[PDB]
Write a protein that holds these residues in place. Structure first.
Motif, short mmCIF file in Angstrom:
data_model
loop_
_atom_site.label_atom_id
_atom_site.label_comp_id
_atom_site.label_asym_id
_atom_site.label_seq_id
_atom_site.Cartn_x
_atom_site.Cartn_y
_atom_site.Cartn_z
N UNK A 51 0.84 -1.19 0.00
CA UNK A 51 0.00 0.00 0.00
C UNK A 51 0.88 1.24 0.00
N UNK A 52 0.41 2.28 -0.68
CA UNK A 52 1.07 3.58 -0.72
C UNK A 52 0.00 4.66 -0.63
N UNK A 53 0.18 5.60 0.30
CA UNK A 53 -0.74 6.73 0.43
C UNK A 53 0.06 8.02 0.49
N UNK A 54 -0.37 9.01 -0.28
CA UNK A 54 0.31 10.30 -0.37
C UNK A 54 -0.53 11.38 0.31
N UNK A 55 0.14 12.21 1.10
CA UNK A 55 -0.50 13.32 1.78
C UNK A 55 0.42 14.54 1.70
N UNK A 56 -0.14 15.69 2.06
CA UNK A 56 0.57 16.96 1.97
C UNK A 56 0.59 17.65 3.32
N UNK A 57 1.16 17.01 4.35
CA UNK A 57 1.33 17.69 5.64
C UNK A 57 2.41 18.76 5.65
N UNK A 58 2.49 19.61 4.61
CA UNK A 58 3.03 20.97 4.64
C UNK A 58 3.29 21.31 3.18
N UNK A 59 4.14 22.28 2.92
CA UNK A 59 4.64 22.40 1.55
C UNK A 59 5.61 21.25 1.19
N UNK A 60 5.51 20.14 1.92
CA UNK A 60 6.31 18.93 1.74
C UNK A 60 5.43 17.70 1.50
N UNK A 61 5.79 16.89 0.51
CA UNK A 61 5.03 15.68 0.18
C UNK A 61 5.42 14.49 1.06
N UNK A 62 4.43 13.83 1.65
CA UNK A 62 4.65 12.69 2.54
C UNK A 62 4.04 11.44 1.91
N UNK A 63 4.82 10.35 1.89
CA UNK A 63 4.36 9.05 1.40
C UNK A 63 4.41 8.05 2.55
N UNK A 64 3.24 7.58 2.99
CA UNK A 64 3.14 6.51 3.97
C UNK A 64 2.94 5.20 3.23
N UNK A 65 3.94 4.32 3.30
CA UNK A 65 3.91 3.08 2.53
C UNK A 65 3.97 1.89 3.48
N UNK A 66 3.59 0.74 2.94
CA UNK A 66 3.68 -0.54 3.63
C UNK A 66 4.54 -1.45 2.78
N UNK A 67 5.74 -1.75 3.27
CA UNK A 67 6.68 -2.57 2.52
C UNK A 67 6.30 -4.04 2.67
N UNK A 68 6.20 -4.74 1.54
CA UNK A 68 5.89 -6.16 1.60
C UNK A 68 7.05 -6.94 2.21
N UNK A 69 6.78 -7.90 3.09
CA UNK A 69 7.86 -8.66 3.72
C UNK A 69 8.55 -9.60 2.73
N UNK A 70 9.72 -10.07 3.14
CA UNK A 70 10.50 -11.04 2.36
C UNK A 70 10.31 -12.40 3.01
N UNK A 71 10.03 -13.42 2.20
CA UNK A 71 9.81 -14.75 2.74
C UNK A 71 11.14 -15.27 3.30
#
Length: 328
Positions: A51-71
């Motif tokens: 999952x990837x979600x983008x937000x704008x908590x200032x004049x700065x771009x924030x990406x909250x991501x969920x990294x898939x695990x490695x088996x």
């Protein structure tokens, strides 16, 4: 809009430099929502994130991501019929192996394909379930449990008298891959009697839908080895000749007008006889009477079968039954 800084939260094994490299948006560009969603699609195309979600908590771009695990670990538990190597090979093709990205939307297909692998060896009741274990550096251990179930009975079906269908088609009428045969423990219990009745109905239907109106089952026997569980079925049939439709008459009816009686003409004179088409005409009549308030209607069919010319005339007679009373 204009990004003064870019921040990425959620990374565990992926490095900030790596994600900044693969991001099409850079600090200092004038961005809009379409470009941000397109950058999210580019990041998704790497297959590293659930999952990837983008937000704008200032004049700065924030990406909250969920990294898939490695088996990190893949084990087989309670597995005996198929060895660990063959299951390893089966899982390796759908991307399930040690060192691979574990997609979240993968569990269902893992279980499905391993269960198909078991249903290709007689185990239609095999149930596999895989559990996910967490580990520190965004890794996941896979615990795959197999309950192998019980093996299907092995069938030998002998179709004495068949000249119309190949034995493939005949044996398909006994449905040797459905689980009802599992409950057949004696040659004469209720379950074997129900299975034989349904199978003989399927055979009869095969023949009657192809015009063999004189088909008859000559004899049938079911036997089970009380040793290693084998089922032996023997059915001898008398096919008779193939027949064509003759004249169809609809008697006793007062619901239909002459022209309306050709919505029931789903077969024509000279066509090969077909029991299913005849039953479909019955059902058309029954629906017409039900819509008219006759809830207990039935149709009787009297055939006039000439074996010499091989043609069957049909007289449908309607027994409407009681009409529902309109209250006024």
């Amino acid at each position: 809009f204009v990004v003064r800084d870019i921040r990425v939260n959620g990374l565990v094994r992926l490095t900030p430099a790596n994600v900044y490299t693969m991001l099409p948006i850079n600090s200092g560009d004038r961005v809009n929502e379409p470009m941000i969603a397109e950058a999210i699609r580019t990041l998704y195309a790497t297959g590293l994130f659930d999952d990837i979600k983008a937000s704008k908590e200032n004049d700065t771009l924030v990406f909250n991501v969920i990294e898939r695990p490695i088996i990190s670990k893949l084990e087989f538990k309670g597995n005996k019929l198929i060895p660990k190597e063959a299951l390893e090979q089966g899982l390796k093709k759908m991307g399930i192996a040690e060192g691979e990205v574990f997609k979240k939307s993968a569990l269902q297909t893992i279980e499905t394909e391993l269960e198909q692998q078991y249903t290709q060896q007689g185990r239609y009741d095999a149930d596999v379930t895989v559990d996910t274990v967490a580990r520190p550096n965004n890794r996941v251990e896979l615990k795959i449990n197999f309950n192998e179930g019980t093996p299907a009975k092995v069938f030998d079906i002998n179709v004495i008298g068949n000249t119309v269908f190949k034995d493939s088609e005949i044996k398909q009428a006994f449905a040797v891959k459905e689980s009802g045969w599992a409950s057949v423990v004696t040659r004469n219990d209720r379950y074997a009697r129900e299975k034989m009745a349904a199978s003989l109905e399927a055979l009869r239907a095969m023949y009657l839908n192809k015009g063999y109106i004189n088909f008859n089952i000559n004899n049938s026997q079911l036997n089970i080895s009380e040793d290693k569980k084998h089922i032996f079925i023997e059915v001898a049939v008398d096919e008779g000749s193939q027949f064509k439709f003759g004249q169809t008459k609809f008697l006793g009816d007062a619901l239909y007008k002459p022209e309306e009686l050709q919505a029931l003409k789903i077969y024509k004179d000279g066509d090969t006889y077909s029991q299913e088409k005849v039953n479909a005409v019955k059902q058309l009549l029954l629906r017409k009477y039900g819509n008219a308030g006759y809830y207990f209607a039935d149709v009787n069919i009297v055939p006039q079968i000439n074996n010499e010319t091989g043609v069957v005339d049909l007289n449908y007679y309607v027994n409407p039954g009681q009409q529902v009373t309109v209250r006024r």
